[PDB]
Structure 1
Amino acid sequence: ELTAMSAWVNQDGSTLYINSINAQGELTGSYINRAAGFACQNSPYPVNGWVFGTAISFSTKWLNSVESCNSITSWSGFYINTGGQGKISTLWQLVVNGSSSPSQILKGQDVFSQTSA
């Protein structure tokens, strides 16, 4: 149920909108960040990545036509079905332009639930 045209919302209210997943599993989409305390909110950021069965990676560069956060986030995760409901559970890494040490790469965890209007 990791499919093209599926949307996923995390604990901050941020949403991954998956647009396409091609025959090879290559992913395109958009992400809208709504996490308090972060910048680059409320506008769409292009996403690319891969799907392999239930495994998924997706990444976004925080630059678009309205706002830059000078960095890139990459999520690695997996789809799970629980209670008859799909979720994607992820770990992310955030690398900032101009970094000089691996210690500067930020890590965190996001869990996403399936969503639609």
Structure 2
Amino acid sequence: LSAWTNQSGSTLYIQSVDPSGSLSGYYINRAAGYGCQNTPYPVTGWVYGTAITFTVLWENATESCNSITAWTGFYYQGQITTLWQLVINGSTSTGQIISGEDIFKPS
């Protein structure tokens, strides 16, 4: 499979991209200061030429962080540059949606 590590040490493990552009994978979070680190969380999304989206549910057999992330970005010059948005369960305001930028390189 096709592994991509960001500036924070987290890795996207792509298992499959169908001819439809449907992506399936798993993701290990190693970002400082976050729960749900060091264990697999499921991935879904889309691949369309150099454009990509993917989204991780922060629940697996062992740990839950009660939330989801969606990444949106693009493949250029051997890296996937992404903007991500993180929404917590029970949220009442878009002001509570946390955001940032991730750069993934092959690993």
TM-score by length of 1: 0.90
Residue from 83, 97, 103 that aligns with 1:105 = 97
Q: Please tell me the residue identity of whatever aligns with 1:91.
A: L
Residue from 13, 31, 35 that aligns with 1:39 = 35
**Aligned-partner SS, 1:103:** helix
User: Structure 2: how far apart are the matches of 1:95 and 1:49?
Assistant: 17
User: Structure 2: how far apart are the matches of 1:67 and 1:16?
Assistant: 18
Q: What residue in structure 1 maps to residue 83 of structure 2?
A: 91
- Segments of structure 2 that go 5 or more residues without pairing to the other structure are none
User: Structure 1: how far apart are the matches of 2:103 and 2:24?
Assistant: 19
Q: Any runs of at least 4 consecutive aligned residues in structure 1 with deviations exceeding 6 A, and if so which?
A: none
Residue 66, structure 1, aligned to residue 58, structure 2: no
C-alpha RMSD over aligned residues: 0.6
Q: What residue in structure 1 maps to residue 44 of structure 2?
A: 48
Residue from 15, 19, 29 that aligns with 2:25 = 29
Q: How far is the alpha carbon of 1:61 from its aligned partner?
A: 0.5
- Segments of structure 1 that go 5 or more residues without pairing to the other structure are none
**Aligned-partner SS, 2:26:** strand
User: Structure 2: how far apart are the matches of 1:13 and 1:70?
Assistant: 22
Residue 76, structure 1, aligned to residue 68, structure 2: no
Q: How far is the alpha carbon of 1:104 from its aligned partner?
A: 0.7
Q: How far is the alpha carbon of 1:69 from its aligned partner?
A: 0.2
TM-score by length of 2: 0.98
